[PDB]
C-alpha cells in the first residue's frame, strides 16, 4: 500500500552524480528504491540515463545495496 519510491524529478544523465533536485518521492507501482534512501543516493551514479518520472530501481544505481 503507501510505500513510496524514489522517482526521477528530471532526466538523470548517465554517469552523473545524483543531487537532491533530481529525486522526488511518490507512491508508484511497481515499488523501486524506498523514498527513505534519497540521502544515501546523493552523489551515487546511475548506469543508464533515467527519463523524467521514472521510478529509480536498485539495478540502475552503481554501488547500491539496500
Q: Where are the beta strands (DSSP E) in 1-66?
A: 5-8, 23-26, 45-46, 61-62
Q: How was this structure determined?
A: X-ray
CA-to-CA distance for 35 and 24, rounded, in angstroms?
8
Q: What resolution, expressed in A, was reported for this entry?
A: 1.6
Q: What is the dihedral of CA 59, 60, 61, 65, to 10 degrees?
A: -10
- Which CATH code fits 1-66? 3.90.1210.10
Distance of CA 62 to the CA centre of its chain: 11
CA atoms within 13 A on the CB side of 21: 2
Instruction: Collect all residues with Cβ–Cβ distance below 8 Å to 17 and sequence separation of at least 6.
Output: 43, 44, 45
Q: Cell 511497481 appears where?
A: 30
Grid coordinates belonging to 41: 543516493
Handedness of CA 38, 6, 31, 48 (dihedral sign): negative
Amino acid at each position: 500500500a503507501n510505500q513510496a519510491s524514489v522517482v526521477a524529478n528530471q532526466l538523470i544523465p548517465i554517469n552523473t552524480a545524483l543531487t537532491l533536485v533530481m529525486m522526488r518521492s511518490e507512491v508508484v507501482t511497481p515499488v523501486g528504491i524506498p523514498a527513505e534512501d534519497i540521502p544515501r543516493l546523493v552523489s551515487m551514479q546511475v548506469n543508464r540515463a533515467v527519463p523524467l518520472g521514472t521510478t529509480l530501481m536498485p539495478d540502475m544505481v552503481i554501488g547500491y545495496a539496500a
